[PDB]
Amino acid sequence: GSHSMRYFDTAMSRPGRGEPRFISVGYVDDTQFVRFDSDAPWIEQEGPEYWDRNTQIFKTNTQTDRESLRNLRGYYNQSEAGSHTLQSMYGCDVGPDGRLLRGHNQYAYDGKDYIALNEDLRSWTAADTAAQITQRKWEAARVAEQDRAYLEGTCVEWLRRYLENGKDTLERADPPKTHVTHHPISDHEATLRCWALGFYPAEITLTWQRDGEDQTQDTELVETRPAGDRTFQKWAAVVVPSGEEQRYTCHVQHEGLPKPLTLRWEP
């Protein structure tokens, strides 16, 4: 199916505790493939020239981000006392044919959106007056054309290569293993919990229906969570009146399943 490559970058200042820590992690879908940290199978196949080029770009990125953090403190009239965070997230999305669906290149400062490259890969959206300064500088320096070139070229090219080299895991969707548990809360009510375990990728839809009606408001949904062995887990629960369990159906949709599942409590 469709695939994505993304790098998730975090630069964090720490006044009095050295220079800002910089970490860049690379993913193909929900699979981390690389980590570069200033505090430090299918990928090692690449060779030394690949490694040397990536580590050198990472070192350059660390210096650019350290200077951006200095600039940001000034743009927001902040003191040198506090810790601040600049985040960058970029990459490409491709369809089954490996063709570009869209590119991404965005930034956040202190957890707030700062500036982002638009879907057109030519123009910027600045969140505030400080980001309008960055937009003006980046328009003058033709930064979008450089980012576009990576997003349309390099990103798609390398993503295609990684999917070929890592085909046995990257191209394999592992279906959820599912079951429904029953937990009496009182003599009048019980919790029905619908489980999904060992699935990949993380994207999944878990729902409960009562008489074929979606129970969106009465369903407790936990966030999808990593198991630690590449797979993910999720559960959805509903509180049901004792004896009415059979009116409830859990519905599961996932890429690894040819047909969705409909599950009920099986006493």
Binding site: Y7, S24, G26, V34, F36, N54, I57, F58, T60, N61, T64, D65, E67, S68, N71, L72, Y75, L86, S88, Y90, Y107, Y109, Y114, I115, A131, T134, K137, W138, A141, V143, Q146, D147, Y150, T154, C155, E157, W158
Partner: peptide
């Protein structure tokens, strides 16, 4: 493949 960042904010 990592992308270079040469322009500061």
């Amino acid at each position: 493949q990592i992308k270079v960042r040469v322009d500061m904010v």
